[PDB]
Structures are given as structure tokens and as C-alpha cells.
Design a protein around this nucleic acid. Structure first.
Length: 156
RNA sequence: AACUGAAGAGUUUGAUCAUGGCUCAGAUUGAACGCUGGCGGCAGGCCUAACACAUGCAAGUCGAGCGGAUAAAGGGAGCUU
């Protein structure tokens, strides 16, 4: 589906000769409010056209996320580049408390109780990779129990 | 009766990623200063010169321990209040 959310806008450039050609980039994540997200990056020549391009690439190559219901399954920790990310599920009344670019991922996924923090280099185009290695590699235990459930899930 | 919280941003460049400094958003004080100023509860008030101090007051009490001297009421008498 489609619920859109913008994060970043830049002004990249390019020197040719004579002057300097400008261009705009944008980063936009799209989710469904249930656990299907997708991010997208587009470059164009103006703001109202660079956002439209980044929205279209978001709703291609999406991710199914197996959330527990407004929370996560377990504390995990993933990294990409020089960016390290930590996330652990929380109680009911606590909302989402994260920084800038992990709120926009964790809104549209539908989770509400995420309690996150990012270390290392804060790059909004690169902390998103650090988040999607984490969420796309969840497990959601298909087991008979948890304190007993290590005889039917390990064979899954 | 026993008991749960973790946010980032700006700045090196024609522009980008990284390393690395700096700076801001918070909660606090025996606080001082500037502008302004109705009320009441509960608190606190020399952090500097352990530097000198006028004048008041802050440890006395026992006559069921003993001398001594003050000697009432009253008992009076006497003399004339």
C-alpha cells in the first residue's frame, strides 16, 4: 500500500565548465502501517519532482517485517557502514523514542514501542540500511513454547 | 507488602563518504546581578578576613550540710500613744 514519509533533502552539485550545475536528491520511506515497508532514493532537478521519483522506487523492492504487534521480538543490534544501531522492545505506554531517521522507519512499519539508539556516524541515508538489516532478519518463533520452544523452532 | 528507561542537530568541501575537534537543546545551585512585583503555607539565610571587637545576655543551685546576723507575727509588760 502507501503511506509516505520524507526524511532528507540535499543540494548536490556538478562542475562542468562555465558554471556549476545543481541537482536535488531525496530519501523517502513508504510503509503500510502493518509491517510492510520500503525506502527509496531519487535524484532530479527540483524539489516537487525529486520527491515523486523517490516515492515510486520505494513501493518497489519492499520488505515484510514480522512484528509482535506494536513491539519487536527481542533486543537486537545491527550495523552497516560506520553506523551501529541498537533496538529493544519496550512497555505499552512508552511511544517511539529514536532519532530523526529511525522514527520514520519505525512509524510506517506500525511498531510503537521500539526504544532505539544509533551510534557511530549518523548518516540518514545510511542508518536506514543499518535498520533494514535488523528488521528483515527477524524470526517470529514458530514454536510450541519459548522456555520450552527449542525442539520445533530450531528445525525451522 | 515486590517491582521497568536509553532520541539528536550545526560547522572542514565544487559536491560526497569517513576520521576528528568545537558549539547548542536538558536537569540542577547556601548563588549574584538586570527588569518587574498581590497572597499564604513549609523551608532555608557569612561559601570571603580561623580579621579585629563598643555595649547587653548565654551555669548555677541547695537554710530537710553547719556557723553567723536580720530578726516578723505573736506572748507581752510598762509608760501614755
Amino acid at each position: 500500500g502507501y503511506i509516505e514519509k520524507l526524511v532528507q533533502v540535499n543540494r548536490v552539485a556538478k562542475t562542468v565548465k562555465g558554471g556549476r550545475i545543481f541537482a536535488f536528491t531525496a530519501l523517502t520511506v513508504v510503509g503500510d502501517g502493518k509491517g510492510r515497508v520500503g525506502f527509496g532514493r531519487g535524484k532530479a532537478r527540483e524539489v516537487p519532482a525529486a520527491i515523486q521519483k523517490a516515492m515510486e522506487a520505494a513501493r518497489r523492492n519492499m520488505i515484510q517485517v514480522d512484528l509482535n504487534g506494536t513491539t519487536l521480538q527481542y533486543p537486537t543490534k545491527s550495523a552497516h557502514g560506520a553506523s551501529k544501531v541498537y533496538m529493544q522492545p519496550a512497555s505499552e505506554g512508552t511511544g517511539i523514542i529514536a532519532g530523526g531517521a529511525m522514527r520514520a522507519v519505525l512509524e510506517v512499519a506500525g511498531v510503537q514501542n521500539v526504544l532505539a539508539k544509533c551510534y557511530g556516524s549518523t548518516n540518514p541515508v545510511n542508518v536506514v540500511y543499518a535498520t533494514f538489516k535488523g528488521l528483515k532478519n527477524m524470526q517470529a518463533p514458530e514454536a510450541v513454547a519459548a522456555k520450552r520452544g527449542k525442539s520445533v523452532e530450531e528445525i525451522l
